[PDB]
Amino acid sequence: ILGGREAEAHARPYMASVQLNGAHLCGGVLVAEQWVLSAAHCLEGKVQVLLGAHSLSQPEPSKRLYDVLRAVPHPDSQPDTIDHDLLLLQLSEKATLGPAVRPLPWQRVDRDVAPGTLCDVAGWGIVNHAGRRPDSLQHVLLPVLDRATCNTERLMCAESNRRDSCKGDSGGPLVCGGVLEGVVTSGSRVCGNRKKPGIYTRVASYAAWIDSVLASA
Numbered sequence: 001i002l003g004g005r006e007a008e009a010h011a012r013p014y015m016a017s018v019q020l021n022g023a024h025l026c027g028g029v030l031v032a033e034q035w036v037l038s039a040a041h042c043l044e045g046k047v048q049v050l051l052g053a054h055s056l057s058q059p060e061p062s063k064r065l066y067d068v069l070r071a072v073p074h075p076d077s078q079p080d081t082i083d084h085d086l087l088l089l090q091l092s093e094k095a096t097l098g099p100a101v102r103p104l105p106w107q108r109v110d111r112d113v114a115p116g117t118l119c120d121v122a123g124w125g126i127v128n129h130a131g132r133r134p135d136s137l138q139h140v141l142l143p144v145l146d147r148a149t150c151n152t153e154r155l156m157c158a159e160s161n162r163r164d165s166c167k168g169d170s171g172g173p174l175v176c177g178g179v180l181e182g183v184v185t186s187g188s189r190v191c192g193n194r195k196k197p198g199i200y201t202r203v204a205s206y207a208a209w210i211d212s213v214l215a216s217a
């Protein structure tokens, strides 16, 4: 997250860190007791999910690491596009839920968020153009753009005036009104440049797919 602030500890209990070899790789969102949503290019070693965290490195009683039983990328995802860039991760067991570990409701109704609404994006992605990697969860509020400025019907954008998502925030949540609306996409892009908006996968466009996969337990 560029141009953001340290989040309050455990105040976004849906957050997840998607980890490779013990190292944060992508954001993710707990969307059911046993399922985390993230981005497709995250899956392309050992993939694990860390829930209940604020610090990546410091002891916290709420922190628990999970193995992944099944990874379900979107079947139309491809490694060279940011279309269909969703990934569902089934945890090896149901997560122990509590105030620090809670699923977030996600948008099933296919309507755009009102342009200019401020939504919250969180993550442990880089925090400056030197690639400084934060130990504690970051977040920022960002205004949603109209579709015509963003240019599909399956993507939304947000302003990128120095405040923005960036590398390592991929897969993480864009939240409005307490509901997941977007998932940070996982393609490379210039960050922080007002002419080059942040891009996020519109979760409401994928309602049937998500429901399907979650139906499969």
Ligand SMILES: NC(=O)n1cc(NC(=O)N2CCC[C@H]2C(=O)Nc2cccc(OC(F)(F)F)c2)c2ccccc21
Pocket: 024, 025, 026, 041, 042, 124, 125, 126, 132, 133, 134, 165, 166, 167, 168, 169, 170, 184, 185, 186, 187, 188, 189, 190, 191, 199
């Ligand atoms: N939407 C955005 O603006 N972006 C999304 C990006 N894609 C990723 O981010 N990833 C691809 C999959 C794994 C992942 C990744 O590289 N993860 C990664 C790799 C090394 C270190 C790392 O941790 C930390 F973020 F802290 F650096 C994460 C990205 C890259 C550069 C610039 C903008 C970017």
